[PDB]
Design a protein around this ligand. Structure first.
Ligand SMILES: *[C@@H]1O[C@H](CO)[C@@H](O[C@@H]2O[C@H](CO)[C@@H](O[C@H]3O[C@H](CO)[C@@H](O)[C@H](O)[C@@H]3O)[C@H](O)[C@H]2NC(C)=O)[C@H](O)[C@H]1NC(C)=O
Length: 141
């Protein structure tokens, strides 16, 4: 029904409010792209690395990820195009697809710290220091 504005997942994006992060209200059927940091020749900045995960409320609050969690976005090519389209669909086409329900809250965070060495860190990171997290209040407002 509508393509929401894309979310650029990087430390210079102001949509992430201090402390609170980003809060959205997507509706079933909408789509949203999460775009990995990309540096080329007209985009100034240092390589930024992140693993982005869908997690539960508790994990978001504590900025932690369990080793059973699998990234929905693995930003490991700071020099290329890497993005993930979240489709707020009720039914997934496969085992790895996402499914959403109306009037349900979903969270996305990264406990990576932006550096190559902290890509796999499972606690803190930008979730904790820069509020780089997203709350999606599906089917609401
Ligand atoms: C970090 O996130 C920034 C967004 O908060 C992002 O800025 C946005 O970058 C995109 C990609 O370059 C720009 O895209 C637009 O401009 C290009 C060039 O003309 C067009 O081809 C596209 O179609 C599109 O219109 C956005 O304009 C820009 N938005 C803002 C607010 O500046 C940074 O690029 C990200 N930085 C890194 C290092 O990934």
């Amino acid at each position: 029904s509508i393509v929401l504005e894309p979310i650029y997942w990087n430390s210079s994006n102001s949509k992430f409010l201090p402390g609170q992060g980003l809060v959205l209200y997507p509706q079933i059927g909408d789509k949203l792209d999460i775009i990995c940091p990309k540096v080329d020749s007209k985009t100034v900045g240092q390589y930024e690395y992140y693993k982005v995960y869908m997690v539960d409320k508790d994990q978001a609050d504590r900025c932690t990820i369990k080793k059973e969690n699998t990234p929905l976005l693995n930003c490991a090519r700071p020099d290329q195009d890497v993005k993930f389209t979240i489709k707020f669909q009720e039914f997934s086409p496969n085992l790895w697809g996402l499914e959403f329900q109306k009037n349900k809250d979903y969270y996305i965070i990264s406990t990576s710290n932006g550096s190559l060495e902290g890509l796999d860190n499972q606690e803190g990171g930008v979730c904790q220091t820069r509020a780089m997290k997203i709350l999606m209040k599906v089917g609401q407002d």
